[PDB]
Amino acid sequence: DPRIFSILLLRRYFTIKGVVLFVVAALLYRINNRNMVESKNLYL
Amino acid sequence: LAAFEGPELHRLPGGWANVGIWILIVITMLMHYDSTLYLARYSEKVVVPTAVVQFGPYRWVRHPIYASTMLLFAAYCTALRAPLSLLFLLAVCLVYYNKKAKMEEELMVESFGQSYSDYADKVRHKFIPFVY
Amino acid sequence: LVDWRKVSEKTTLLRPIELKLVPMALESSAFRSKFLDTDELLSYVSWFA
Fold it and tell me: Which chains touch B (3 or more CB pairs under 8 A)?
């Protein structure tokens, strides 16, 4: 129910804490799609 | 039959084509929960309704619990992208659910009098919205 | 749709500020007749708010 979010949203530390987890999640997702060996053939 | 007629496992795509099963599963869970809650918030005992429920999915369809079970059936069958098994599942579940819906509908018609009659006149579609 | 003559004959003992607050209470009592649930109305009210 959007009101459940909205009551807490309408009520400096929290934003920075939430944006740190944003760049950490971005890092983990970006590292997640690449194979550790990009060139299997050139190392083969 | 959905398992077998469906293709081999890791070849089905991803990306933006796997959002449909997400939203359909969310819809069937939401509609089933609403149907069960609206059916259980009025009955005194386990299944003993007092008034007629005509709220939530009941104002779109006469049997939303059965159609939600139907829709998660279709969700599993559509996750593996097999239309024919979805159709046969639809046929058999339509037959049995329609039989059981007919007995329960005549029971509440007999038991409640005009109330369920006008409720059924308000919403005719028994299983699928404006299809059945 | 409301014949206000008979409503005036039903509010003879009343006062102008209550004569002003009559219509919304009248609509509420009109909505009282049908059969409806609290939580659906509450959900719609929350969504619209």
Answer: C
